[PDB]
Structure formats: C-alpha cells, structure tokens
Amino acid sequence: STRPLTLSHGSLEHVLLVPTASFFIASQLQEQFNKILPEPTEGFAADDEPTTPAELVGKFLGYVSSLVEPGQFDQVLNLCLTEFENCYLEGNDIHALAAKLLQENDTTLVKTKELIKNYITARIMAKRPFDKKSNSALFRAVGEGNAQLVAIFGGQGNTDDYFEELRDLYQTYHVLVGDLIKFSAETLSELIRTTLDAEKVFTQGL
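and the corresponding structure tokens:
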C-alpha cells in the first residue's frame, strides 16, 4: 500500500503517493523541505519560490539529491523521480518541459534552468543515467534520411560576456560537464606552467 502526502508551497501544492514502508522517511524529508522553503507570495513573482507544481516537485527532487549521497533517502528519491517523470515528463525530454513552462506558464527562465538542474542532477544521482538512446524527432528523421545535419561553431565577437555562458553551463550541467571543465582547467594550467612566457601574459592567472 501507499499512504499519500502533499508537498505544498502556499497556494500551489502537489500530492505524492509514497509507499507505506518509507512513509516516515518521506515525511521527515518533506518537513525538512518545508523548513528550507520560503513563505509563498502573491503572484509568486519573487525568487526562491516555485510558481507551478512542476517547479515544486523539481525543488523537492533537488533537495533530496543534496541529501542523497552515493542510501537512506535513495528509495524516496527514485519514487518521487518516477512520479515527477510520469506526471510532468509525458515521455518527453526535460528541456521540452522547461520550454513548455516558459512559453505557457508564467515562469522565469532562471526557475526553468533550476528545474532542469534539479531533475538532471537527481537522475544522475539515482543511478539512472541517460545511457538509453533518445527518440528525439530530429535525430530519428536524420536516421531515416529525412534530414541532414551540419554543426557550426562560432568564435570571437559574438558577445562581450561569454564567461557568463560558461558559468551557466557549469552550474546547470555540473554533473555532465564537470569532468570536462576540470580537465580543461588542469591542462590549461599545465600549458601555462610549461610555456615560457604564458604567466607574463596571464597577469591575473587562469
């Protein structure tokens, strides 16, 4: 059996059906989550507060992932992961859900990025990587011969604040590109050290 509970944030709230076996673990995690979640506001126009139930579930998911560390809360993590997927990710990619939330609902781009971050980090933390190949319409079309893809890479001049893009790509997808970025930093530092006059150019370091 599975007694239910309601992860709620003021006006907006969502109901979860946890198994009876781990109901107490779920309830303690829920109480902690209400403890770390700020009071609701009219219009939810402020930050750090969900605006739609999808956002609330994703925030709970990220909180559990923060406590989850590869056993205690693992089972509830998986259970609520599956509930969120089955209710909000109708066999569609998380990015599709984020785009839906932006376009139709009145959610900020930052909140959608945070939801993506929570869901993806939880998916990796729950031993549910994305090893299974996707069925994205575009790549299906390419395989069927319907479409042809060419990849292009830009360069200097596009923007004055590119490091912000690097920052966002690090923050949201930390669990996917952390190794890449760390290897990049390490090899860059090694090249600086081995290169004769690099440090002369790199006055403030790299």
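(Above: one complete record from the training split.) Residues 1-134 form a domain with the Glutathione S-transferase Yfyf (Class Pi); Chain A, domain 2 fold (CATH 1.20.1050.120).
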